[PDB]
Design a protein around this ligand. Structure first.
Ligand SMILES: CC(C)CCC[C@@H](C)[C@H]1CC[C@H]2[C@@H]3CC=C4C[C@@H](OC(=O)CCC(=O)O)CC[C@]4(C)[C@H]3CC[C@]12C
Ligand SMILES: CC(C)CCC[C@@H](C)[C@H]1CC[C@H]2[C@@H]3CC=C4C[C@@H](O)CC[C@]4(C)[C@H]3CC[C@]12C
Ligand SMILES: CC(C)CCC[C@@H](C)[C@H]1CC[C@H]2[C@@H]3CC=C4C[C@@H](O)CC[C@]4(C)[C@H]3CC[C@]12C
Ligand SMILES: CC(C)CCC[C@@H](C)[C@H]1CC[C@H]2[C@@H]3CC=C4C[C@@H](O)CC[C@]4(C)[C@H]3CC[C@]12C
Ligand SMILES: CCCCCCCCCCCCCCCC
Ligand SMILES: CCCCCCCCCCCCCCCC
Ligand SMILES: CCCCCCCCCCCCCCCC
Ligand SMILES: CCCCCCCCCCCCCCCC
Ligand SMILES: CCCCCCCCCCCCCCCC
Ligand SMILES: [Cl-]
Ligand code: NA
Length: 543
């Protein structure tokens, strides 16, 4: 391990970060979490968390990676050897996230392959998967039995084929399994070979999604009924703020969308030069991420308002209110533009491009963090390609559980418990507490001043010292005191063993800190206080 290879230029670092932390979490997860919580009231805790913990923790991870010049699992050895379980917890969280983050891309691939016909299959109600209820959206207001929309019927009876419950796995769907295999093969081939920053390819891969988003926003804003959707999206409801669910959802959506507590930002920052101003760039990238999410919300809620006006029902009873809101709302939008197939193909290509870069960055970060533990064995003595192939195969086999007829429930369980929620709060709280109260805020500020050239303000120091731990602990305690079980589409109730499995998924990463603390204490010689003093001393964080 001579030295980590630095970036060729700052543009490479900026492009890598932008492609890694802007993606499906901005256009797929934000809208449905906002819709589930009623909209409007979701934006107050969202912005509170964004300006209290979101940017400061992201900058802290980047600056720690740059300072220590080490990955996301070994940097904590040079800051606080006792609290070295944070890296292991992050690697567990990223391993669990990589398994279920790709089923969305499998669904997108299915939709893209299905959009190559003369007429879109989700536009009408005369097919083998339709039910006697299916009625055209144009005729819903004209007449009147619980009618169903062709888009929802398609999504629920052709792509998913939903089962009565999680205890009814049904049979494996081979068409979705083939799409999952295809996307996993593409991901594996784009990592073993190592996709380079081709000037033309990236120039297009990083500009097409924003153009498509602008086109969708312009189309949505001119539909009849967009004003009601915008008012539903913007105006808040103070009564909803008395529940911990909205607070925890909005708080952890920021953590999910900024890719923190994952070990990926530390790895990305480890390739920076020592004398590099990585503060302004981080602020601008956070601005870009938040703006992208906020802009996409306008378009999706305008489409929802138009659909609600057309069908003649409320805006809260038009879509899934779960991980299918985008797949219900955006195809309905593209069915109204001229040449619907062209725009459908373009939209799904944009979705795939947004997802694939994030998946690439996360898997690369996980691999490079797990390799640094044994840099001798897994570099020459054993093949790195074989290790990558084994990881991909195991992840695909594990993700096969969400492809069966009853896999939506497993996907929802994974989304709620793994790589989101209490585990993210736990990791963020421990990172901030360690840095602020064991290493030293001013001690880190000296290194930041040495690296970037100027001393920052007290905002980051205060956020690390007080604001973030208080928010995390308060949200955790508020959620625990008033407990409400998880549901799917506000109607399905999970069995007890499913909740136990979800809590085990959450605890698999949360249990890594005390175990590592105990093992480190047991591996040291001498009196207890001497051992504690020896393991709280930073082992020369390279300055
Ligand atoms: C809607 C949301 C997402 C917007 C929130 C982001 C803001 C908090 C950003 C916008 C631009 C950022 C600023 C852009 C420029 C600078 C100047 C920079 O100082 C220098 O570049 C000095 C250069 C030198 O001396 O070499 C310090 C960071 C700062 C204040 C950034 C701090 C945070 C700011 C205000
Ligand atoms: C970590 C890995 C090794 C765990 C094992 C993954 C594989 C071997 C497991 C996980 C879930 C399993 C599937 C779950 C449900 C069904 C439906 C049944 O009608 C055919 C078998 C099938 C398709 C199982 C086959 C094997 C399976 C895919
Ligand atoms: C010396 C340089 C680096 C100092 C940089 C100061 C910047 C990074 C800090 C200092 C004070 C901070 C602001 C303090 C108060 C608010 C009000 C809140 O509603 C939005 C966030 C906002 C606007 C903060 C955002 C960023 C901020 C302007
Ligand atoms: C130098 C020392 C600290 C390295 C020793 C590694 C130990 C402390 C770490 C490395 C990764 C960690 C494991 C990662 C994954 C799991 C699976 C989970 O189901 C139980 C906890 C468990 C088993 C963790 C326990 C502690 C663990 C084994
Ligand atoms: C409804 C939106 C509310 C947004 C509230 C954001 C609160 C952020 C507090 C940050 C305080 C930083 C002080 C820095 C002073 C130098
Ligand atoms: C819940 C399972 C998630 C996936 C498993 C992640 C574990 C990663 C490896 C842990 C460290 C192994 C080496 C220990 C000796 C240094
Ligand atoms: C017919 C009885 C139930 C059969 C199993 C249904 C649930 C299967 C998914 C949950 C187990 C795997 C989760 C991931 C574990 C790492
Ligand atoms: C759901 C987890 C999938 C990925 C599994 C990652 C762990 C792979 C095996 C452990 C590698 C590190 C130890 C190697 C010892 C020679
Ligand atoms: C909202 C219902 C009660 C929850 C409030 C819990 C107290 C929050 C502050 C606790 C102190 C933070 C611990 C570490 C900060 C230095
Ligand atoms: Cl977001
Ligand atoms: Na991306």
């Amino acid at each position: 391990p001579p030295q980590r290879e630095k970036w060729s230029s700052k543009i490479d670092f900026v492009l890598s970060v932008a492609g890694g932390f802007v993606g499906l979490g901005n256009v797929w997860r934000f809208p449905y979490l906002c819709y589930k919580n009623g909209g409007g009231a979701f934006l107050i805790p969202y912005f509170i968390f964004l300006f209290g913990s979101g940017l400061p923790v992201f900058f802290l991870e980047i600056i720690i990676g740059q300072y220590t010049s080490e990955g996301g699992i070994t940097c904590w050895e040079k800051i606080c050897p006792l609290f070295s379980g944070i890296g292991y917890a992050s690697v567990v969280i990223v391993s669990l996230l990589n398994v279920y983050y790709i089923v969305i891309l499998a669904w997108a691939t299915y939709y893209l392959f299905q959009s190559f016909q003369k007429e879109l299959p989700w536009a009408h109600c005369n097919h083998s998967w339709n039910t006697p209820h299916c009625m055209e959206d144009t005729m819903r207001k004209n007449k009147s039995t619980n009618f169903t929309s062709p888009v929802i019927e398609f999504w629920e009876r052709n792509v998913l084929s939903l089962s009565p419950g999680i205890d009814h796995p049904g049979s494996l769907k081979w068409d979705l399994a083939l799409c999952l295999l295809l996307v996993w093969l593409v991901c594996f081939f784009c990592i073993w070979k190592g996709v380079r920053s081709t000037g033309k390819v990236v120039y297009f891969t990083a500009t097409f999604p924003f153009a498509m988003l602008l086109v969708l926003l312009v189309r949505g804003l001119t539909l009849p009924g967009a004003g009601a959707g915008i008012k539903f999206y913007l105006y808040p409801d103070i009564t909803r703020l008395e529940d911990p669910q909205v607070w925890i959802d909005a708080g952890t959506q920021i953590f999910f969308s900024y890719a923190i507590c994952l070990g990926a930002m530390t790895s990305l920052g480890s390739y920076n030069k020592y004398k590099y101003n990585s503060y302004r760039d981080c602020m601008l990238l956070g601005c870009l991420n938040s703006g992208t999410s906020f802009v996409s919300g306008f378009a999706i809620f305008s489409i929802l308002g138009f659909m609600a006006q057309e069908q003649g029902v409320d805006i809260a009873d038009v879509a899934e209110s779960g991980p299918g809101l985008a797949f219900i709302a955006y195809p309905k939008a593209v069915t109204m533009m001229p040449l619907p197939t062209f725009w459908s193909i373009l939209f799904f290509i944009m979705l795939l491009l947004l997802g694939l870069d994030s998946q690439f960055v996360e898997v690369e970060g996980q691999i490079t963090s797990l390799v640094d533990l044994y840099p001798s064995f897994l570099r020459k003595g054993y093949r790195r390609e074989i290790f990558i192939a084994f990881v991909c195969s195991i992840s695909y086999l594990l993700g096969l559980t969400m492809v069966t007829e009853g896999g939506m429930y497993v996907f929802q369980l994974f989304d709620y418990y793994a790589a989101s929620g209490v585990c993210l709060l736990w990791v963020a709280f421990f990172e901030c507490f360690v840095i602020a109260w064991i290493y030293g805020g001013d001690n880190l500020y000296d290194g930041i001043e040495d690296m970037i050239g100027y001393r920052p303000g007290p905002w980051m120091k205060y956020s690390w010292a007080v604001i973030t731990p208080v928010l995390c602990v308060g949200c955790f305690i508020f959620s625990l005191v008033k407990y409400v079980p998880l549901t799917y589409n506000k109607t399905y109730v999970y069995p007890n063993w499913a909740i136990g499995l979800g809590w085990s998924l959450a605890l698999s990463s949360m249990l890594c800190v005390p175990l590592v603390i105990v093992i480190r204490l047991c591996q040291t010689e001498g009196p207890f206080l001497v051992r504690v003093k020896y393991l709280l001393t930073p082992r020369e964080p390279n300055r």
